[PDB]
Every structure is written in structure tokens, then in C-alpha cells.
Design a protein around this nucleic acid. Sequence first.
RNA 1: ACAGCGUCGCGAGGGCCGCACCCGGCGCUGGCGCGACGUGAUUUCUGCCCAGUGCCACGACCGUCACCGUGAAGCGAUCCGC
RNA 2: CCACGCGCCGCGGCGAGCCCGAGGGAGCCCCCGCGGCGGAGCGAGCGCGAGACGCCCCGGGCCCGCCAUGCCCCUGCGGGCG
RNA 3: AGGGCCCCGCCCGAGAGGGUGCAAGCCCCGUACGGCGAGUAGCGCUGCUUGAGCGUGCAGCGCGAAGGGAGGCGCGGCCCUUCCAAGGCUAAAUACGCCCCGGGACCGAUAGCGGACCAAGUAGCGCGAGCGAACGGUGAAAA
RNA 4: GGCGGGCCUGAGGCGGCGGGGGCGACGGGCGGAACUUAAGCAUAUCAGUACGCCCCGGAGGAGAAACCAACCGGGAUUCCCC
Lengths: 195, 53, 84, 243, 201
Amino acid sequence: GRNVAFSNMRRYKCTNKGPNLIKNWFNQPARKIRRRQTRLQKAKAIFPCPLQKLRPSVTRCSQKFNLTQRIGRGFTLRELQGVGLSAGKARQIGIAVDPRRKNKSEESVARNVARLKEYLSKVTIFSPEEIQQAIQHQGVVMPVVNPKPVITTGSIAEAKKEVPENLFMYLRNARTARNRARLAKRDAEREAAAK
Amino acid sequence: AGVQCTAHSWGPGRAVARLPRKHGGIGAYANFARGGHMAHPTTVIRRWCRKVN
Amino acid sequence: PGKVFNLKKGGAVVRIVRKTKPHQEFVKSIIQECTGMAPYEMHIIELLRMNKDRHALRYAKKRLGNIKRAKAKRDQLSVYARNI
Amino acid sequence: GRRIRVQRKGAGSVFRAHVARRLGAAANDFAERTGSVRGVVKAILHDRGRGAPLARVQFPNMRGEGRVNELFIAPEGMYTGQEVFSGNKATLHIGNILPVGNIPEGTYVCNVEEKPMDRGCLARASGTYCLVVAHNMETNKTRIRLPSGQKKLISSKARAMIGLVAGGGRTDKPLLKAGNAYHKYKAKRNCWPVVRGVAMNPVDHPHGGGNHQHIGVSSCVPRNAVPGQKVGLIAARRTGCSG
Amino acid sequence: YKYVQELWRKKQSEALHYLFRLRTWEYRQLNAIKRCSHPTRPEKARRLGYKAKRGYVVYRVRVRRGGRKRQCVHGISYGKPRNIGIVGLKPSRSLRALAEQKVGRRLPSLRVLNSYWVAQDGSYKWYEVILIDPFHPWIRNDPKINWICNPVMKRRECRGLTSAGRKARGLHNKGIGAMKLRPSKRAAWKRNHTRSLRRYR
RNA sequence: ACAGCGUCGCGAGGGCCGCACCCGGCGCUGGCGCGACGUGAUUUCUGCCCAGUGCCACGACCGUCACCGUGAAGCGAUCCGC
RNA sequence: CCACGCGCCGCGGCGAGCCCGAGGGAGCCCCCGCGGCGGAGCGAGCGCGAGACGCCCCGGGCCCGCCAUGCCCCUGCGGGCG
RNA sequence: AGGGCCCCGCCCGAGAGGGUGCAAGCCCCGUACGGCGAGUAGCGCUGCUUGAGCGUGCAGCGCGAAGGGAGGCGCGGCCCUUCCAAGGCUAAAUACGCCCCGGGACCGAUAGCGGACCAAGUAGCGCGAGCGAACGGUGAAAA
RNA sequence: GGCGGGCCUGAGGCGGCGGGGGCGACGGGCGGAACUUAAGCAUAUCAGUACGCCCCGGAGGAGAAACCAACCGGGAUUCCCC
């Protein structure tokens, strides 16, 4: 016994009977081989065409990761006006379309409009030898790379006009403002009742 | 393994040992008894794969 | 708190994009003269006419469901008692 | 514990009526509603279990062809060949069936239908009679004194036989031996012998058994008791032999 | 049909109460599973997906209106105290589903689409099911309904794959609160309660 | 167990049981009947007690004791009532 | 015995870092590979948020929160200093 | 009886293996190697369930809308952000026996399937539901 | 009074075309325990488990928001890592 942190495990359920809940991964090498052949057969079905498709660049959701970008379901119709294409045409050129997606920023439309332009520039469309020697895209098309951060070498005096002196007080004043004003209503209300 | 048998202990006063006994009176379902389920059976859950950095 | 506190939120521009179908009302009037009122409603219109509306906002919430939809039932029913 | 004897009696297994070799079961047609249908008592036979003698009588098939035989618990006084008449205009005699309203006050009745055209209900036991006593023309309801003596109101169009059922005095005979009961109960359902509940072990009966064989708490059991609880005298207004 | 959708919305209205009073009376004096010549409510039939094509059959199944009584014998459930209930249990599936399952058993050859509501009486509710003949050449040679003759869609109503099933399983609710029943009520528990024992571990 | 002896419910739109329900037994019955109970052939009888605990009331509604309904309130849950 | 949590102890690599994750690479022991965990606490929470010393150990002294208290104040039921 | 030793060699894109009378790349088969949206949503009251907590999902009965739902503490009032319930279809990546194929740092006849045996769900036993054994090896050739 | 003609509900019969039952798995819909654990035991727990029942298919179910979130946002389903 002694100082053991309490076990957080869950007592085993249906161990010898009912649902088979033990699923050992003994096929991990085997599954990887199976997926590779299937991916290779799909690539052969359209030799010029890429196996995967261009996906939109989207900001990762939630404050913790909201400064980097990840690949998403599809380009919005407003982002398709930038490349001047209808939804069906976009499917023909390999652009996946999320009609539900709403940009939520004008800035969002622009990073996406740039991504759409590159696909249209890079792609070559054929309706014999060229198709044989085309070379398809291997990998996610244009995988988005979040850049590493930098130092911008600005001027100290110019930046000092922006911040109030004793910055801590300014941040605290607006952090506690809802509470501080609320006390003022309670405080004034207490005074109103008597005198 | 060894569990594919119906054996229930005979009980004291019959003279024979109280271990699961098949209808015949033949020992069954015991780590020692002939044909019995191994005391703790070997199982695939053992981690055959160690990990190296 | 339900949002992170950033004294300035908005380094990026934001999007600015965010009815009755009147023909149906014509369908409703034709049905209303063919059908009449609902029996719960006829009690509410009487309650509005003879005994206040506090009771006729309580009897609505009970016979219907929520206050927002009950206060509505008061408005639609109010016209019949007051107009005559 | 276990379901007591009364509980098992509902199933109908081993406790059913032994109705084999019974003679059979003992309609206001237009001709009998307007007038009276003549009949002849072909024979009087002994039904199994039923103490009262039955009778087979045949009346013409009003429907169109044949003679339709009937079975009727018979009133005392029947003769094979009796001109039994049933109907509104049937005269007052033993054996005749006429609507209770027509029956004159006091005329004994048997086989009184509770409701008009019920084809037989009250007073069909051995030596049991009813008494027509009061006719109210308003609702056309004539009070009869049921054998028990409780008086009910019977609709005038309900009909009944005139007279008292035969077999009168059957009970006023001591059986003397257990065998004579065995052979009365063989004909009827399996209910005899009856073992007392003070005799049974606690598991079988609520009166149950104890180191001294008693009924324990009072025999009286409420009218609202569950099916296992109703084992003593039920809803007893008074107990004891009195005056 | 817009003037027939609104007319019905006022069911408590005397007009339709007179109709319902006669319709409940006729259905009562009639058999349990009756084949209906026409869908008693055409607009509702068309909304659910009924066209007047050969190979589409309408059948009405009466269900008892009631709360569940367990099958435990003599009225007693011999288990731990929590399980001792027999008279006040409430059905798991809506009467709508019950009507479909009863119709599906009566005609196993036919396939069940959706079901509408036709009338109700304090003793029994009457749900009118819409069924489709999967073998008529018209149905197989019709692009829109061809999906019924797929053999995966055999016995939609026994496996609770109808709308009533999608209401009982709670599939209709989406988002927080159904997260633990989407793959299936049983599968989601199974996926969560599994020891992966990944090999490289 | 039994013959006998009592007690007790019940007039069928009813008693008393079956019974997951659908509904079945007594009942092809009808108070000289169906059931529920005791006691245990005759001869002779069967005292007194209703406090308690049972049971019973076309014995009333005193008080207490539910859901609905309904009053008063509060914006509304809800709460006080009757 | 075997899996799986947890507490230690020894060892191996690497060190403010570290990690055969699932996967993907004509790829299977080879390459590539995120959360995670640590790097900071404390408070129920709004939140506030550590430096001053030393081979080590131990204690002392201070510093950060949580809890009262005084003072001063500026961008005030807010900030500073005790 | 060499498939043994002892001298010597030969083929290898084949030295995986099995057979053959003793331990066989070269004695045989092989192996490498080729080719041809209304009785609804809601609400009340009960039951059922969930980690969902003045309620996660469901249902019974009562009662039942029109702009209505959600935002994880209720209840009203005011906004915001986001979606259209009460109709359906739809590949992929996921699961898994019988069945067939390969590999096992697997057990080697009281082991390993109950069952390695010419006839194991068999001989038997039990009214029945059901239970369920034991039993492999002569040699190079039956000579 | 009767007697035809349609419409509408309902009958018999024929023709074609389907249904049924079989799988120790996987997948759906149900009805649903208890030993066990709480060192007793009622809620809890085993467990939305066995078992009973009805269903398909090579997969099945699920699935294109009356979705998440609160951001310099995502955006059908299923499965994996966390």
C-alpha cells in the first residue's frame, strides 16, 4: 500500500463473454501494406490525375491553435469567385468545394483565393503520349506550411506612444470593469433607499 | 481449452476429492486434472513488442 | 468566462453577411372561415373579454407550451375579443 | 409459500366440472310473443350433478319443418304426454311458461329469466320456488321473492315456468356415509374431500400449522383482501350462532 | 395541398372532429391490419414519399394505446429491488414504430417506407403505413424509388431503420447528447470501451 | 379424512379464483346453488366477556387525508390558498 | 504466469527539453512522424503569478499566490509600497 | 543400406524445403528463373436510460404551436453567434467466423482442439433437454 | 316496387412474379438478468453483460447539420492516435 496515487483505471468489462473488446494491433504491418496497394491501384485508375485533391487553407479552430493553418473540407463559393469558377467546374479541376463553409473574414477569402489561383496555374488539362508522361501529384496538393516566427527590429520610442504608462493598471481596469461597475449599482442602490 | 467440459464439484461425504468432476466422476476443469484448463493460460495480450527510442 | 480576454480582438477584417412568404396568409384565412376557432382559443378570447389577461396568459402557457408562444397566442386571439 | 387450494381452482385443471353423459343445457319467437306454442313432454330424465329432474319436450319448428326438442328443469306435477304450453296466452297451470307480468300474484315460479328472453336464470335448483308478489305497471316490473328471500324487480316481459321444481326435500336426507358424498361429488366437480387449513403446514395455507394447531389471527378477512388473503369468512357482518 | 395541410392543422375544429368521429368509428368496427384503397391522407402520403405508381400499397395498422406491462409471470419480477416493476413501465419505441413492425410481420414480402397518422381513440391509435412492392417492373425501372429494392433495405422496420426507429434510437437529435449513440447505441459504447493494446506499445 | 354440526360471502351489470395481455375456471351452474372457513357420528349440552385485536355497516361526514379543478399573488418558474 | 494502472529503485539514450503516436515513404529492424508530458505555482472562484542568497544536505532569510491590515496613489472596489 | 568418412571436383538468378535404405545444391520432386416537412416540435405528469448535472436520449397519457431550434444552471426580459427538426438516398477508410492460403522464439500423444489412429461428436450413457470417452509408432522391405 | 349503367368500398378464382427457412462470427433493432463489487446491504455495481427474440448484408450501421464552438475559428459520416 503506502503512498500510491489512486488507480484511475476502469475494471475490465466483458472480459471472457459477450462483446470482444480486446483488439490487439497484430496487423499494423499488414494494414499498411494493404492500404499501399489500394492507394497505388487508385493512382493507376487516373495516371495524370492526383490521388488526393486541393483542400482549402483554414485557420486551426480555438484560441490555442488559432495562429496556424490546416487543410480543410472545401473552398467556399465566395473564394471560388476569385478563380471565377462554378462549383461543378471546380470538381472537374480537382478543387473540393465546401458550399457550407463561410469565410468569416475578408482576409480568409484572400489566402484561399491565392491557393485556388495556384492550382489553376499548376494544373494541365487533357481531353496520348502527354498523358503517358504527365507525372501525377504524389502527396496532399500544396501542403500548407506554417512559417517559423521571426523578430521584426522595430523602434522602442514609437511603440511607447501606443501603451499607457503602468500598463498593468490599464489591463486590470478593463478586466474588473464589469465587477467594479456592478458594485457601483449595488452601492448607489444602497444609498438611494435611505437619505 | 479444457473449458469445453461440464464439470461440477461432487461435494464432501462422497469420499472423492472436491475438484470439478465430469458426469463420469472423471476429473475435469482443473489446472492439474487430465484435460483441465491450464492454471493461467498463455495469451496474445503479452507484449511481444518492446519499444526502443 | 466564455471568451479569452484580448484587449484588442480584430487584427483581421470580419464578414458582414447574415421573412413571411405572404401567400400562405391567404391560405390561412380561407381555412379559418372554413374551420372556425380552436376550443382552447375560444376560452382565451372569452377570458380576455370578461376577466383580465393575466389569467388569459396563464391559461395560454398551460394549454400551449412556452411563454414566448403563449404571449403570441394572446396577440392573435386578442384581435377577436377587442375588435367586436 | 405456495398458491393455496382456492388459487389453483381457477386453472380448470383437475378441478373442472365432470359434465360428461349430462343430458344437456336446461327464445321469445314471434308466434310465442303474439300467442302460445303447444308442446308435449316426451320424457323426464336424470341429469348428472343436477339434483332436479330435467325433461325433454318437443314443439313444432316454427322456422318451417320438424319438431324441436327442448330441455327444461321440470316443475313437480309433470306427466309424460303433458300438453305444456309456452307463450303470452298460455293458461295458468304447472309447466306452462308465461311472462312474469301475466302470472297472477303469488303464483309460484321457477326458471325466471332475469331479463326478457334470457332463456333461464333464477330458481332452477331442487325444490326451489320463487313468489310473484308486486306488479308496478309504470315500469312494468314485478317484484319476485328470490329463493334466498331477497326481493328483486323482474321486467314484465321476462318469463318463467309456473310451479315449484321437483326434487323437493332432497337435502333433508342425512347422507350417513362418506361414500354417499363421494358419489354425489363424482358427478359434480372435484372438491371433496376438503382438508382444513389448520391441518396444512405453514407453506400451503394461511391458517397454517404451529406447535398447537390454531387459526391464529381472526378468521374474518376484509372484502378488499388480495386473492391469497381471502381464506377465512369474508366480509362477515356478524359471527357466532344467535337468534 | 397547401389548403389541405392547413385544414388539417386545425384538427380540434368541429369540421374535422365530425370526420374523425366517423373515421375512428369505422376503423373500430373494422379489422386490425386493413389494406387501404387510397392513402386516407394524400398530402401526407406524398410528403413521406408516396406516388400513385403500381408497386405502392397503403396499409393501416391499429395499435393499443397504453403503458407497458412486463411479461413476468404471476405479476412478480424475482430480481434485486430496483428491477421490481411490472405495471408502470413505458414502451421503448413509439406506437408509430409498433404499427410499422406489426405491418412488416403481416406482409414480409412488401417493404415498409414511412408511416403517417390517420386517427386516434382513447383505447387505440391508428397509424397508416405506406409500403412498396419491391418487385413490380415499374418500381425496379423507376430511378427515384429503386433504392427500396436494394437487399440491404430488407425489413427496414425490424432493424429500426425507418423514421420511427430514427426517433427511438434518437438519431433525429444531432450534436451534443447524441454523440454517444451515432455509430449505433451499442457500437459507440463498444468503441469507447475497448483496450487497443497497440502493437508498438 | 369422514357423516353430522355451525359460521360466512354471493341474485349474475354477481361472488370467488385464473391471468404479461388477449381474457379464462366454478358454470352444460342459480341460493335444497357455487365458494370460503372452522368443528368433527350419536347421548347430553354449549356459561360469561366487544376492553384489546380482527370484521361489519342505503352509519353518518366531525377532523385529517391526494391528483385534477379553482382562487390570490409574482415578470416567470413557482408559492400561498381553497 | 500474463496484461494493465500506480508507488519506488537501478540502468540506457537525450536534456529545457523529450517522445519506434496513428500513419506516410517501390517502405518494413530504414527514413519521416502530432497531441502528450515537463518547463510555475496558488486560489472555491474573479483571478493573481515566484529570485536573495548556496558543493550538497539541513535550517534560516526573503519572493509568488490564498487571508486579513495600514499607507500612498495613477490610467480606481484599480495600481504601488510596506 | 550412405544421405558416413577420405581425397578430389561441378552448378548457383537455384545452398527454401520434402522424398530416397545412415547426416544429399549436384539421386528424384522441387527452388531461383518465365510466358500466355403537425397530433408534430413543445409543455405538464410518470416510467426508462445517460457522465449530461431544475434532466443525456426515449416513451406513455393529458395538452398542444408558428418563424422555430441550439449555445452544456434553472426562470423571465433584451440582444448576439449559429442552424433548419418533425421525409429519404449515398462509395471510401472500419469489423468478422465457417471457408482457403501462408508463417510461427507455439504443443508434441495425461501435451496440443472433445477428437494426430481408415469408421470423434464416434463407442456408449441418459425417457429427455443433454453429456461424451479411450485408441498413434514392426521393419529398409512383409521378406 | 323491381331492373340495368357507371363510380366506390368489398368478395371468389386465374396468370405471372416475389416471401418463408439455413450461418458458434461481424452489423442492426429489441426484451433483459443474476452471481460479482460496495469487505454487510436496499440506490449504485456487475452491465446498457450473458441469455431469449426478430432482422439483413458482404460488410452492416452511420451520413451530408434545427453541427461544433466562441477563434486572427471551423464545417456530412465512419475508423485511428491523443
